[PDB]
Ligand binder design. Structure first.
Ligand SMILES: CCc1cccc(CC)c1NC(=O)c1nn(C)c2c1CCc1cnc(Nc3ccc(N4CCN(C)CC4)cc3OC)nc1-2
Ligand SMILES: [Cl-]
Length: 264
């Protein structure tokens, strides 16, 4: 308690830590006017030039792309030095991953609204040549019912190093396993929707990771799509989770899909 920090001359009161990973921490904070933000702190002391560049590149894209869609998290300010980065970001209620863990059933409307938000954010980054390639529910922040994409997958994650469902392959596409395309983000989004529809990711039940990786790529391993009242949702899932990326549906196609367009 009673910690503060400064970012471009502005003093922020730290209320609590709300996340961490790699060599970074996220803080719920207040500025001088008692407006709430999240500050993301990245420790750069161990970073090589390649890693420093990947962080610079991500900050530049995030700062640019927030003006192109409200489904991308706001970045209000940042301070960047050799030792660290402080990013003053939009505050959210909770991330999507934690929310889905709390909820047994998701409301069909809620599920559809979240889907629309994700497609729009991801479509935005693709329009600027960015493939995320590691989309999971944790990459989305819920802000007053609206999803915001938190990151673009450009920054190279540094290792924990210090004393101090992680690195999961459940959202990984076939083409990523056999060793880059916007279709890769479609598979991952499809895995998120699949989770929101049937309460688990398509290959979740396979505990052995080698088996699971083989199941992702094996075209004889049929993915189950049990019947549900929303036949358009069932179709979206089937189209996202085609193993051949060339046969897989595109984001502009998903945006014109009756699941997102037809007023039910
Ligand atoms: C996944 C993206 C990523 C990639 C690399 C490095 C990092 C930093 C750890 C990240 N993570 C973040 O960049 C990040 N993580 N979180 C939690 C936030 C961010 C960015 C900004 C942000 C804004 N508002 C929130 N709110 C929030 C989220 C989760 C929670 N919790 C509390 C602990 N529970 C066990 C789970 C749920 C609480 C929150 O606010 C009170 N939360 C956040
Ligand atoms: Cl905007």
């Amino acid at each position: 308690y009673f910690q503060s920090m400064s970012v471009k001359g502005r003093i922020y009161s730290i209320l609590k830590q709300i996340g961490s990973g790699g060599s970074s921490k996220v803080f719920q904070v207040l500025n001088e006017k008692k407006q709430i933000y999240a500050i993301k702190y990245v420790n750069l002391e161990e970073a090589d030039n390649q890693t420093l560049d990947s962080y610079r590149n991500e900050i530049a894209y995030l700062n640019k792309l927030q003006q192109h869609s409200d489904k991308i998290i706001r970045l209000y300010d940042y301070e960047i030095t050799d030792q660290y980065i402080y990013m003053v970001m939009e505050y959210g209620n909770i991330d999507l991953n934690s929310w889905l863990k709390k909820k047994k059933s998701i409301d069909p409307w809620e599920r559809k609204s979240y889907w629309k938000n994700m497609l729009e954010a991801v479509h935005t980054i693709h329009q600027h040549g960015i493939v995320h390639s590691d989309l999971k529910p944790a990459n989305f922040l819920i802000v007053d019912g609206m999803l915001k994409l938190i990151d673009f997958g450009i920054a190279n994650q540094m290792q924990p190093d210090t004393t101090s469902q992680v690195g999961t392959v459940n959202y990984m596409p076939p083409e990523a396993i056999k060793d880059i395309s916007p279709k890769s983000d479609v598979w991952s989004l499809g895995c998120i929707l699949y989770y929101m529809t049937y309460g688990k990711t398509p290959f979740q039940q396979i505990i052995n990771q080698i088996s699971k990786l083989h199941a992702i790529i094996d075209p004889n391993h049929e993915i189950e799509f049990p019947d549900i009242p929303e036949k358009d949702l069932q179709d979206v899932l089937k189209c996202c989770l085609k193993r051949d990326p060339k046969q897989r549906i595109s984001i502009p196609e998903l945006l014109a899909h009756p699941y997102v367009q037809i007023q039910t």
